[PDB]
Ligand binder design. Structure first.
Ligand SMILES: CN(C)c1nc2ccc1CCCCn1cc(c3ccccc31)C1=C(C(=O)NC1=O)c1cn(c3ccccc13)CCC2
Length: 347
């Protein structure tokens, strides 16, 4: 009962500090992403995660200012923030969730068992949703992978986190190319591309999809150089025309020609055709040929989720999949027809 008490500015509301108290401060993480503690809210009893960073007093913060314009239930909610190695740290109080998709995938795999397809449908849909909400701002995550997909096991609700790498993409302004974890890095980035679009999130989510079908990473590779070699094995060698689309700085190739290994004989035998059809639309050399998140939500692979008489393996109802705002449908309103099925329109 060693209660810390600070004054903290609410995350999405108006700029009006309150008093807040909590306890049970133990460390849960410490790495590239920063320094995170678990903690317990005195009043409610609820759990939280608290990220801590030395902040350059004379400057804004790119992570804080991105999270303060966000309120989506597939995105980890920022509750409060405040300040406090010698001088000035920034603190962010976040919703706590104990399991991840990576952890859950890992368990099925090492025991030599496949992830039931229903869980594959649930997880990607909610991800594509989460991508659609941020892409309607210009904000690109730039670190989609299974370890950044938090998950409630009993309910199935899933929440993207870690907006440390996230950035608002602007036409004409250059951006760094060595970014995202290697196995989930789009080929344009590899090629040196500097004015890439938010469709790099869509590539990465494709790599996550295939992983959940095979029970292991689709493109490993043992270096930044070897990562395009593992890709080429599957999609063959790209054309000068494809290489132009990714980066207009390459004219001559540096690695012999290979032909495309077909999609059907990459996975196992019983795999559903729409999983494979979808996967082909995500993993394309050409950025503009890849689907949009919202278009991905409307794929025929997710039709089972829009059934009314559908439940989880533990009997329960599925979480709400059809409470789309206008902001969320804003990039293509016509799709409402499909995204919201009849029974979810009940006046
Ligand atoms: C094993 N393991 C190393 C691991 N790594 C990650 C995710 C989960 C896990 C295991 C689950 C244990 C519970 N667990 C939940 C965590 C968390 C954070 C650190 C350690 C454990 C942890 C949470 C978050 C978050 O936003 N809200 C959370 O509740 C964040 C995840 N990250 C960042 C970064 C910056 C700010 C907040 C958070 C990125 C790290 C990726």
């Amino acid at each position: 009962s060693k209660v810390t008490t600070v004054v903290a500015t609410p995350g999405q509301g108006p700029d009006r500090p309150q008093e807040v108290s909590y306890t049970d401060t133990k460390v849960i993480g410490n790495g590239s992403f920063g320094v995170v503690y678990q903690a317990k809210l005195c009043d409610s009893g609820e759990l939280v995660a608290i990220k801590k960073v030395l902040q350059d007093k004379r400057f804004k913060n790119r992570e804080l200012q991105i999270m303060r314009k966000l309120d989506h239930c597939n995105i980890v909610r920022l509750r409060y923030f405040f300040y406090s190695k010698d001088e000035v740290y920034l603190n962010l109080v976040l919703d706590y969730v104990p399991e991840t998709v990576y952890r859950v995938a890992r368990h099925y795999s090492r025991a030599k068992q496949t992830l039931p397809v229903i869980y594959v449908k649930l997880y990607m849909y909610q991800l594509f949703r989460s991508l659609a909400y941020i892409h309607s701002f210009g904000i690109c995550h730039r670190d989609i992978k299974p370890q950044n997909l938090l998950l409630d096991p009993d309910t199935a609700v899933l929440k993207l986190c870690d907006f440390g790498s996230a950035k608002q993409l602007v036409r004409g302004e250059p951006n760094v190319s060595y970014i995202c974890s290697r196995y989930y890095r789009a080929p344009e980035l590899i090629f040196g591309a500097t004015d890439y679009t938010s469709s790099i999130d869509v590539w990465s989510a494709g790599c996550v999809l295939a992983e959940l079908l095979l029970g292991q990473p689709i493109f490993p590779g043992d270096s930044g150089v070897d990562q395009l070699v593992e890709i080429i094995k599957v999609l063959g060698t790209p054309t000068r025309e494809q290489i132009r689309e990714m980066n207009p700085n390459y004219t001559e190739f540096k690695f012999p020609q290979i032909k495309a290994h077909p999609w059907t004989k990459v996975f196992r035998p019983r795999t559903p055709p729409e999983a494979i059809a979808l996967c082909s639309r995500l993993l394309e050399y050409t950025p503009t040929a890849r689907l949009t998140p919202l278009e991905a939500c409307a794929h025929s692979f997710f039709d089972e989720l829009r059934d009314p008489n559908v439940k989880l393996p533990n009997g329960r109802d599925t979480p709400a999949l059809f409470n789309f705002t206008t902001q969320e449908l804003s990039s293509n309103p016509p799709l409402a027809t499909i995204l919201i099925p009849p029974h979810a329109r009940i006046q």
